Amino acid sequence: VNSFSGYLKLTDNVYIKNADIVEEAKKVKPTVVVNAANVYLKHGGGVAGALNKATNNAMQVESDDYIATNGPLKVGGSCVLSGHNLAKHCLHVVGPNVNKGEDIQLLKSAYENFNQHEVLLAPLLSAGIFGADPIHSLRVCVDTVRTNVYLAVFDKNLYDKLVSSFL
Numbered sequence: 659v660n661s662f663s664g665y666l667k668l669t670d671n672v673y674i675k676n677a678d679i680v681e682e683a684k685k686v687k688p689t690v691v692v693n694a695a696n697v698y699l700k701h702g703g704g705v706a707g708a709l710n711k712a713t714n715n716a717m718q719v720e721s722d723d724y725i726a727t728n729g730p731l732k733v734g735g736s737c738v739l740s741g742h743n744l745a746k747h748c749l750h751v752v753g754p755n756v757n758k759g760e761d762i763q764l765l766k767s768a769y770e771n772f773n774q775h776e777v778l779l780a781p782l783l784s785a786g787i788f789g790a791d792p793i794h795s796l797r798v799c800v801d802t803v804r805t806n807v808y809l810a811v812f813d814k815n816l817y818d819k820l821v822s823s824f825l
């Protein structure tokens with residue numbers, strides 16, 4: 659038993675809510691919150707900019723030190739950093755950004771990173787300003803992640819569309 663609340667059950671292990679992931683994180687303090695990152699960990703907008711803003715830019719400061727030491731991530735890859743005031747850990751996961759011309763086939767690889775953590779609060783990878791089809795991303799999530807994932811969908815209209823079309 660965990661302390662996520664009001665989540666619609668999609669499958670054995672995937673639950674979904676129309677909620678601001680930043681607000682969910684502040685309320686639950688999960689072990690792992692997933693950031694929809696880019697390879698440079700430049701947290702400008704979307705999930706990343708919003709999470710980072712909620713940490714008072716501490717996420718960005720930590721991320722810049724990480725990149726200075728390790729170089730960029732791979733598209734499809736991830737790293738574990740602090741969750742600051744939002745969670746124990748933040749799993750920064752790089753899905754493909756369609757508006758950058760990146761390979762949508764890498765979405766499955768991106769979701770595979772979730773399997774290294776027993777429970778996660780997460781956004782829908784490559785949705786929003788990443789420009790991929792959110793219905794497809796949800797299908798990849800359910801068909802790839804085996805651990806317990808709680809998806810927080812910001813856009814109300816998107817949430818309703820995702821629920822009503824889910825097979």
Ligand SMILES: O=C(O)C[C@H](NC(=O)c1ncnc2[nH]ccc12)c1cccc(Cl)c1
Pocket residue numbers: 678679680694703704705706708781782783784785786787788810811812813816
């Ligand atoms: O679920 C959605 O609607 C799509 C979701 N977006 C957000 O979670 C979001 N976007 C902008 N500002 C925000 N502030 C608090 C949350 C938040 C998303 C998912 C993957 C990549 C990106 Cl880039 C965006």
